[PDB]
Design a binder for this molecule. Structure first.
Ligand SMILES: [Zn+2]
Length: 252
DNA sequence: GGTAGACTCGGAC
DNA sequence: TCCGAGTCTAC
Protein backbone atom coordinates (compact mmCIF):
# COMPACT_ATOMS: atom_id res chain seq x y z
CA UNK A 1 0.00 0.00 0.00
CA UNK A 2 1.08 3.58 -0.69
CA UNK A 3 0.92 6.46 1.83
CA UNK A 4 -2.78 7.29 1.29
CA UNK A 5 -3.74 3.63 1.75
CA UNK A 6 -1.53 3.39 4.90
CA UNK A 7 -3.37 6.45 6.25
CA UNK A 8 -6.69 4.69 5.55
CA UNK A 9 -5.43 1.62 7.43
CA UNK A 10 -4.33 3.80 10.33
CA UNK A 11 -7.76 5.45 10.61
CA UNK A 12 -9.84 2.31 10.11
CA UNK A 13 -7.76 -0.12 12.18
CA UNK A 14 -7.42 2.06 15.30
CA UNK A 15 -11.05 1.71 16.64
CA UNK A 16 -10.85 -2.05 15.99
CA UNK A 17 -7.89 -2.53 18.34
CA UNK A 18 -7.75 0.38 20.78
CA UNK A 19 -8.05 -0.68 24.41
CA UNK A 20 -7.46 -4.39 23.65
CA UNK A 21 -4.86 -6.26 25.66
CA UNK A 22 -2.33 -8.61 24.08
CA UNK A 23 -2.56 -12.16 25.43
CA UNK A 24 -0.26 -13.92 22.93
CA UNK A 25 1.85 -13.14 19.89
CA UNK A 26 2.24 -15.97 17.36
CA UNK A 27 4.95 -15.83 14.72
CA UNK A 28 4.92 -18.08 11.66
CA UNK A 29 7.72 -16.34 9.69
CA UNK A 30 10.33 -15.06 12.15
CA UNK A 31 12.31 -13.04 9.54
CA UNK A 32 9.54 -10.38 9.56
CA UNK A 33 10.72 -9.51 13.05
CA UNK A 34 13.72 -7.19 12.83
CA UNK A 35 13.97 -5.95 16.45
CA UNK A 36 14.44 -7.45 19.00
CA UNK A 37 16.51 -9.81 16.84
CA UNK A 38 15.01 -12.89 18.55
CA UNK A 39 11.34 -13.33 17.58
CA UNK A 40 10.71 -15.04 20.94
CA UNK A 41 11.74 -11.83 22.72
CA UNK A 42 9.52 -9.75 20.41
CA UNK A 43 6.55 -11.97 21.27
CA UNK A 44 7.27 -12.14 25.01
CA UNK A 45 7.65 -8.41 25.46
CA UNK A 46 4.29 -7.54 23.88
CA UNK A 47 2.24 -9.84 26.16
CA UNK A 48 0.18 -7.97 28.70
CA UNK A 49 0.35 -4.64 26.88
CA UNK A 50 -2.78 -2.77 25.87
CA UNK A 51 -3.08 -0.96 22.53
CA UNK A 52 -3.33 2.79 23.15
CA UNK A 53 -2.95 4.37 19.72
CA UNK A 54 -1.94 4.09 16.10
CA UNK A 55 0.09 6.70 14.24
CA UNK A 56 1.57 6.91 10.78
CA UNK A 57 5.00 8.16 9.75
CA UNK A 58 5.49 8.03 5.97
CA UNK A 59 4.37 4.50 5.06
CA UNK A 60 5.23 3.15 8.54
CA UNK A 61 2.48 2.31 11.03
CA UNK A 62 3.38 2.98 14.69
CA UNK A 63 1.24 0.94 17.08
CA UNK A 64 1.48 2.57 20.53
CA UNK A 65 1.13 0.17 23.46
CA UNK A 66 1.62 0.68 27.22
CA UNK A 67 5.44 0.69 27.24
CA UNK A 68 6.42 -0.20 23.66
CA UNK A 69 5.83 0.99 20.10
CA UNK A 70 5.54 -1.59 17.30
CA UNK A 71 6.77 -0.14 13.98
CA UNK A 72 5.38 -1.95 10.98
CA UNK A 73 6.01 -1.58 7.24
CA UNK A 74 3.71 -3.48 4.87
CA UNK A 75 5.81 -2.96 1.73
CA UNK A 76 3.78 -3.72 -1.44
CA UNK A 77 1.33 -6.42 -0.35
CA UNK A 78 1.24 -6.51 3.47
CA UNK A 79 -2.23 -6.34 5.02
CA UNK A 80 -3.78 -6.20 8.52
CA UNK A 81 -7.16 -7.64 9.54
CA UNK A 82 -8.99 -8.02 12.83
CA UNK A 83 -10.94 -11.24 13.25
CA UNK A 84 -11.99 -14.00 15.64
CA UNK A 85 -9.48 -16.48 17.11
CA UNK A 86 -12.16 -19.15 16.46
CA UNK A 87 -11.94 -18.90 12.66
CA UNK A 88 -9.28 -20.41 10.38
CA UNK A 89 -6.47 -18.06 9.35
CA UNK A 90 -6.25 -16.71 5.78
CA UNK A 91 -3.29 -17.89 3.63
CA UNK A 92 0.09 -16.12 4.09
CA UNK A 93 -0.60 -15.05 7.68
CA UNK A 94 2.82 -14.48 9.26
CA UNK A 95 2.21 -12.75 12.61
CA UNK A 96 -0.88 -12.76 14.81
CA UNK A 97 -1.48 -10.65 17.88
CA UNK A 98 -4.03 -12.43 20.06
CA UNK A 99 -6.16 -10.25 22.34
CA UNK A 100 -7.78 -11.17 25.68
CA UNK A 101 -11.22 -10.66 24.13
CA UNK A 102 -10.79 -13.56 21.67
CA UNK A 103 -10.11 -11.28 18.69
CA UNK A 104 -6.82 -11.10 16.79
CA UNK A 105 -4.87 -8.61 14.73
CA UNK A 106 -3.43 -10.59 11.81
CA UNK A 107 -0.62 -9.61 9.49
CA UNK A 108 -0.59 -11.27 6.06
CA UNK A 109 1.88 -10.81 3.24
CA UNK A 110 1.98 -13.04 0.14
CA UNK A 111 5.47 -11.62 -0.62
CA UNK A 112 6.70 -12.11 2.95
CA UNK A 113 8.46 -8.74 2.51
CA UNK A 114 7.27 -6.51 5.38
CA UNK A 115 9.08 -5.63 8.59
CA UNK A 116 8.31 -5.23 12.32
CA UNK A 117 10.49 -3.52 14.98
CA UNK A 118 9.51 -3.06 18.68
CA UNK A 119 11.21 -0.59 21.03
CA UNK A 120 10.32 1.32 24.19
CA UNK A 121 8.06 4.15 22.92
CA UNK A 122 10.56 6.87 23.81
CA UNK A 123 13.25 5.14 21.76
CA UNK A 124 11.35 4.32 18.55
CA UNK A 125 11.88 7.65 16.73
CA UNK A 126 15.67 7.44 17.15
CA UNK A 127 16.14 3.82 16.00
CA UNK A 128 15.59 2.09 12.68
CA UNK A 129 13.43 2.18 10.68
CA UNK A 130 12.15 5.60 11.81
CA UNK A 131 15.52 7.19 12.48
CA UNK A 132 16.37 9.77 9.79
CA UNK A 133 12.90 9.72 8.18
CA UNK A 134 12.21 13.04 6.43
CA UNK A 135 9.19 15.30 6.94
CA UNK A 136 5.59 14.34 6.18
CA UNK A 137 4.80 15.53 2.61
CA UNK A 138 1.58 17.20 3.87
CA UNK A 139 3.30 19.00 6.76
CA UNK A 140 4.65 22.56 6.88
CA UNK A 141 8.05 20.92 7.61
CA UNK A 142 8.18 19.81 3.99
CA UNK A 143 8.70 23.10 2.16
CA UNK A 144 10.15 24.37 -1.14
CA UNK A 145 13.23 25.55 0.81
CA UNK A 146 13.79 22.10 2.36
CA UNK A 147 13.47 20.53 -1.09
CA UNK A 148 15.78 23.15 -2.70
CA UNK A 149 18.48 22.59 -0.03
CA UNK A 150 18.53 18.85 -0.72
CA UNK A 151 18.44 19.22 -4.52
CA UNK A 152 21.41 21.62 -4.84
CA UNK A 153 23.59 19.38 -2.65
CA UNK A 154 23.21 16.19 -4.76
CA UNK A 155 24.43 14.73 -8.05
CA UNK A 156 21.39 12.44 -8.25
CA UNK A 157 18.33 12.69 -10.52
CA UNK A 158 15.23 14.47 -9.29
CA UNK A 159 13.40 11.09 -9.17
CA UNK A 160 16.13 9.60 -6.98
CA UNK A 161 15.83 12.62 -4.62
CA UNK A 162 12.09 12.27 -4.18
CA UNK A 163 12.33 8.51 -3.56
CA UNK A 164 14.83 9.19 -0.74
CA UNK A 165 13.02 8.65 2.58
CA UNK A 166 15.33 11.20 4.28
CA UNK A 167 14.10 13.93 1.95
CA UNK A 168 10.35 13.33 2.34
CA UNK A 169 8.54 10.50 4.16
CA UNK A 170 6.96 7.65 2.16
CA UNK A 171 6.47 9.34 -1.20
CA UNK A 172 6.05 6.29 -3.44
CA UNK A 173 7.02 5.51 -7.06
CA UNK A 174 3.50 6.15 -8.31
CA UNK A 175 3.33 9.60 -6.72
CA UNK A 176 6.87 10.56 -7.79
CA UNK A 177 5.99 9.91 -11.48
CA UNK A 178 2.59 11.60 -11.20
CA UNK A 179 4.01 14.68 -9.42
CA UNK A 180 6.85 15.09 -11.92
CA UNK A 181 4.36 14.87 -14.78
CA UNK A 182 2.06 17.46 -13.16
CA UNK A 183 5.06 19.74 -12.57
CA UNK A 184 6.30 19.30 -16.16
CA UNK A 185 9.74 18.01 -15.07
CA UNK A 186 11.54 14.97 -16.59
CA UNK A 187 12.33 12.31 -13.92
CA UNK A 188 15.91 11.92 -15.16
CA UNK A 189 16.83 15.62 -14.76
CA UNK A 190 19.68 16.15 -12.27
CA UNK A 191 18.08 17.49 -9.05
CA UNK A 192 20.59 20.35 -9.02
CA UNK A 193 19.48 21.46 -12.52
CA UNK A 194 16.02 22.51 -11.26
CA UNK A 195 15.29 26.25 -11.06
CA UNK A 196 13.65 27.88 -8.04
CA UNK A 197 10.47 28.08 -10.16
CA UNK A 198 10.68 24.34 -10.93
CA UNK A 199 11.30 23.46 -7.27
CA UNK A 200 8.29 25.53 -6.19
CA UNK A 201 6.06 23.95 -8.82
CA UNK A 202 7.30 20.45 -7.92
CA UNK A 203 6.59 20.97 -4.23
CA UNK A 204 3.13 22.29 -5.12
CA UNK A 205 2.30 19.26 -7.29
CA UNK A 206 3.68 16.79 -4.74
CA UNK A 207 1.37 18.24 -2.08
CA UNK A 208 -1.60 18.37 -4.48
CA UNK A 209 -1.03 14.84 -5.78
CA UNK A 210 -0.69 13.10 -2.45
CA UNK A 211 -3.28 15.39 -0.74
CA UNK A 212 -5.85 14.50 -3.41
CA UNK A 213 -5.08 10.81 -2.98
CA UNK A 214 -5.64 10.92 0.81
CA UNK A 215 -8.92 12.79 0.27
CA UNK A 216 -6.92 8.73 -11.64
CA UNK A 217 -3.46 8.60 -13.23
CA UNK A 218 -1.67 10.56 -15.94
CA UNK A 219 1.44 8.46 -16.46
CA UNK A 220 1.92 5.61 -14.01
CA UNK A 221 1.33 2.27 -15.73
CA UNK A 222 0.13 4.03 -18.87
CA UNK A 223 3.12 3.39 -21.16
CA UNK A 224 2.10 3.12 -24.82
CA UNK A 225 -1.16 4.97 -24.07
CA UNK A 226 -1.81 8.60 -25.10
CA UNK A 227 -0.99 11.34 -22.64
CA UNK A 228 -4.27 12.69 -21.22
CA UNK A 229 -3.03 16.28 -21.66
CA UNK A 230 -1.41 16.20 -25.14
CA UNK A 231 -2.00 12.77 -26.72
CA UNK A 232 1.71 11.86 -26.99
CA UNK A 233 2.39 8.21 -26.09
CA UNK A 234 3.56 7.80 -22.52
CA UNK A 235 7.04 6.29 -22.26
CA UNK A 236 8.54 4.00 -19.66
CA UNK A 237 12.26 3.72 -18.86
CA UNK A 238 14.43 2.89 -15.86
CA UNK A 239 15.37 5.87 -13.68
CA UNK A 240 16.88 5.59 -10.19
CA UNK A 241 16.55 1.81 -10.52
CA UNK A 242 12.74 1.98 -10.94
CA UNK A 243 10.22 1.67 -13.77
CA UNK A 244 9.59 5.33 -14.60
CA UNK A 245 6.73 6.73 -16.67
CA UNK A 246 6.60 10.12 -18.36
CA UNK A 247 5.27 12.21 -21.23
CA UNK A 248 8.21 13.27 -23.36
CA UNK A 249 6.29 16.38 -24.54
CA UNK A 250 4.70 17.70 -21.29
CA UNK A 251 7.88 17.09 -19.25
CA UNK A 252 11.20 18.92 -19.81
C1' DG B 1 30.00 11.09 3.92
C1' DG B 2 27.43 10.64 -0.37
C1' DT B 3 26.18 7.16 -3.14
C1' DA B 4 25.61 2.47 -5.29
C1' DG B 5 24.96 -2.39 -4.43
C1' DA B 6 23.18 -6.42 -1.69
C1' DC B 7 19.52 -8.10 0.46
C1' DT B 8 14.57 -9.76 1.47
C1' DC B 9 10.31 -12.42 -1.46
C1' DG B 10 7.20 -15.08 -4.72
C1' DG B 11 3.65 -13.97 -8.67
C1' DA B 12 3.76 -12.59 -13.21
C1' DC B 13 6.09 -13.06 -17.50
C1' DT C 1 14.06 -13.73 -14.97
C1' DC C 2 11.90 -9.33 -13.41
C1' DC C 3 10.33 -6.22 -9.80
C1' DG C 4 10.75 -3.07 -5.74
C1' DA C 5 11.07 -0.08 -0.23
C1' DG C 6 14.01 0.76 2.81
C1' DT C 7 17.64 -0.97 5.67
C1' DC C 8 22.36 -2.61 5.92
C1' DT C 9 27.15 -3.00 3.78
C1' DA C 10 30.87 -1.25 1.14
C1' DC C 11 33.13 1.65 -2.09
ZN1 LIG D 1 1.72 15.03 -22.62
Amino acid sequence: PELPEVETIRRTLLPLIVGKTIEDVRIFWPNIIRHPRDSEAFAARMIGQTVRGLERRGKFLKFLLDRDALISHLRMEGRYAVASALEPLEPHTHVVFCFTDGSELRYRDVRKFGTMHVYAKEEADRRPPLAELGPEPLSPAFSPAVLAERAVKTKRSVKALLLDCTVVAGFGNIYVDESLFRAGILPGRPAASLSSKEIERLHEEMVATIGEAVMHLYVYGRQGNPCKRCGTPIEKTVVAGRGTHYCPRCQR
